[PDB]
């Protein structure tokens, strides 16, 4: 009875989506001038990791960046001078994510240890030591992003997301709507909402203040590995293991466009957006990183040069460079 | 570095100091044997951890014959294996533990499924994984004495009809070992080291040492280029 009612509600939502969509995005964007070919030359090469990098996050000053490696190191980099700024030894060898605070006071990392570790970088003593441990997840930490210097949203392999208060040391809010492992999360510019994708091929939009799921986005055929908001906070792109990326509009609540190419069958590790949002950069498992024109849906450029498989990709805050992290222990900046 | 200021030069020097520390720690890590550990609670994985030793992942660092061994226990996590299985692509060997007596015990689920035939599927899915094609697998068969008593008391024919052997401890153990070896679909690339867990710690630790030693020989030959 309840299952039949749920199916009826899903059918009603699908009918509303079908009726709502009148004009295809591709047709509307057909008349816009194409971006042609985009070529980005390597500017900086970062070495010394000596292990498969998994996570990089840009700061808001557009110069420092954090990087996570599987030797037990977080390295904080000066991107302009190539010098290493910080080298944090980690308690847990296996780290799958790393978040750099907007202020830059703290660095958050996490992984298979079920802990999210917050490191203070502005300590008077001068040694980067463990400030706060967010213990309470049942699955592996997959993504984490600071909102403020006191509140953080983390995703875990227990199908849930959590809002943790750093000073309290406990999870203020629990988000339990997904049925699969939550692989990524992205914060909007206002920070009032955050969308996260899971291993059930769906993404969900969660309200930080209220604590419930606002919207549910389906359309992928496989596990969603990456999610990032469009710069205006009204849309987000997802990349999945079915060799496709999709664009979902929060207000429209439907699949605006799909970015797929026949030759490339490998899954998308990470996705990032440019300052104008016109270009979408996705790191594939084909050892390359593709730049796709968002409106046109064509392919605008290729970033080749990572011998081992790409694991993370991030566009800086002012949009002046893109830094890619791969499993060959080399962080490459493309401009 | 004439153009660079005093602070810039000092920052470059700090970078070089960090590079030195990272190279020294990498040289330390290059002498560490990293062992993946798999199996369940019934299998007796905790027992081998206790014998060898002298929430998400349990690390049991130890030393044997001046060689550093690192064992990671991922069993505790209930998250999907596939998502983090590629994180261990740089592991010398995989120690997989099963229990010989598991076949009699059947989980009280909605449908009756043999535990041993679950462990066989788990071994198959781990062994044929693309990430671990060249990685070696050490196979530990726990609860030998209990297996002996169980096999003599109750025949093995009842679980799976295909076996036609008599109710003999050694014959049944050999059949289980050959079936597990048969599960591997790429024998030429992947050695499997099968062993019967002894009460004496030293025998099991020595067998792990020998398997790891063979893996080190294979890696050294590959670096030399003989293979």
């Amino acid at each position, epitope marked *: 009875q309840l299952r039949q009612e749920a199916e009826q509600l899903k059918n009603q939502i699908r009918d509303a989506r079908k009726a709502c969509a009148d004009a295809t995005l591709s047709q509307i964007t057909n008349n816009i001038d194409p971006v042609g070919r985009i070529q980005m030359r390597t500017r900086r090469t970062l070495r010394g990791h000596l292990a498969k990098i998994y996570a990089m996050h840009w700061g808001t000053d557009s110069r420092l960046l954090v990087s996570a490696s599987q030797d037990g190191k977080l390295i904080i980099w000066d991107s302009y001078t190539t010098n290493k*700024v910080h080298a944090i030894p980690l308690r847990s060898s296996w780290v799958m994510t790393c978040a750099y605070a907007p202020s830059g006071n703290y660095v958050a990392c996490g992984g298979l240890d079920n802990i999210c570790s917050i490191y203070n970088l*502005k300590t008077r*003593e*001068g040694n980067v030591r463990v400030s706060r441990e967010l213990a309470g997840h049942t699955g592996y930490l997959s993504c984490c992003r600071f909102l403020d210097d006191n509140q953080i949203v983390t995703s875990s392999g227990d199908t849930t997301c959590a809002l943790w208060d750093i000073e309290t040391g406990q999870q203020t809010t629990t988000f339990t709507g997904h049925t699969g492992d939550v692989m990524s999360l992205s914060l909007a510019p206002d920070t009032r909402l955050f969308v996260s994708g899971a291993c059930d091929a769906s993404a969900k939009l969660w309200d930080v203040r209220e604590g419930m799921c606002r919207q549910t986005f389906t359309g992928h055929e496989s596990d969603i590995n990456a999610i990032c908001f469009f710069p205006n906070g009204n849309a987000f792109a997802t990349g999945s293991d079915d060799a496709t990326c999709r664009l979902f509009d929060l207000r429209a609540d439907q699949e605006l466009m799909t970015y797929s190419h026949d030759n490339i069958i490998c899954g998308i590790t990470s996705v990032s957006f440019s300052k104008s949002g016109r270009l979408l950069l996705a790191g594939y498992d084909d050892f390359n990183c593709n730049v796709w024109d968002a409106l046109k849906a064509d392919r605008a450029g290729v970033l080749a040069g990572h011998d081992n498989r790409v694991s993370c990709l991030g566009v800086t805050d002012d949009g002046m460079a893109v830094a890619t992290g791969s499993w060959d222990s080399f962080l490459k900046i493309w401009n | 570095g004439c153009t660079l*200021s*005093a602070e810039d030069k*000092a*920052a470059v*020097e700090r970078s070089k*100091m960090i590079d030195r520390n990272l190279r020294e720690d990498g040289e330390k890590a290059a002498r560490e044997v990293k062992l993946l550990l798999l199996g369940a609670g019934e299998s007796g994985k905790s027992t081998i951890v206790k014998q060898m030793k002298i929430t998400g992942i349990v690390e049991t660092h130890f030393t044997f014959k001046d060689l550093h061994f690192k064992m990671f226990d991922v069993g505790a996590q209930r998250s999907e294996r596939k998502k983090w299985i590629h994180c261990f692509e740089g592991v010398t060997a995989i120690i997989f533990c099963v229990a010989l007596s598991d076949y009699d015990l059947v989980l009280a689920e909605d449908e009756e499924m043999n535990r041993m035939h679950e462990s066989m599927k788990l071994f198959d899915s781990i062994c044929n994984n693309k990430w671990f094609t060249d990685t070696s697998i050490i196979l530990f068969l726990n609860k030998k004495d209990l297996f002996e008593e169980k096999i003599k008391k109750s025949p093995l024919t009842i679980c799976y009809p295909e076996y036609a052997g008599s109710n003999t401890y050694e014959e049944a153990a050999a059949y289980i070992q050959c079936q597990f070896e048969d599960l591997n679909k790429r024998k030429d690339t992947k050695e499997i080291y099968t062993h019967f867990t002894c009460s004496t710690d030293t025998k099991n630790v020595q067998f792990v040492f020998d398997a790891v030693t063979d893996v080190i020989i294979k890696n050294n030959l590959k670096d030399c280029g003989l293979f």
Partner: single-chain antibody
Amino acid sequence: VQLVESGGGLVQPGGSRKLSCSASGFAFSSFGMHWVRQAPEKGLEWVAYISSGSGTIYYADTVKGRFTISRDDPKNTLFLQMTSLRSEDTAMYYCVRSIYYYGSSPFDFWGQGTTLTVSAGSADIVMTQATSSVPVTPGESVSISCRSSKSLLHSNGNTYLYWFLQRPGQSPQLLIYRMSNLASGVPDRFSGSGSGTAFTLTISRLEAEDVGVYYCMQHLEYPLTFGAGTKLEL
């Protein structure tokens, strides 16, 4: 974070003396160290620097060859060996910890000072404190001017000017590092402004406690040269 120096007392000219500074409550091995001298009734003066890990060492030319700086990291101790002392070395010597990276605050923490009494540079940038004393009342905003002999604006664009405050009878503290960033723990009363060769410190809503000797330092190239020192009074 604490630094205490020992080895003071009277010395005869031409003798030798070893000072030692013991550091507690911080990662001594990761900080570069400075020795800075202060004449009895005159401004401060930079003596020497040793990087973290001892990779680079700098000395003032007046003390070049006579003074030897060294550090022992397992004991967290800084040593200064002084041979053939002269009558100009009767000064109070401070130890300074400094870390160098993007966004770091070097010269943030100052030692306590060991007094030593020896009882009987055209290329280098010169810092010009134009005034010497300014009489002030608690509450008014006060401006202090400093000048340089060379443009302190590097190609990167970060000015290498530091503003320090020495209270009467106390160690000097860092106030502003790089002329645009306040040092951690300094109230927002202080602000730095200006351009190459002309620099200004503005103290809005001043307090009696704030009053002290203000020093402007360049940090473009070695040897470091300090300013004369603008004193405030009541």
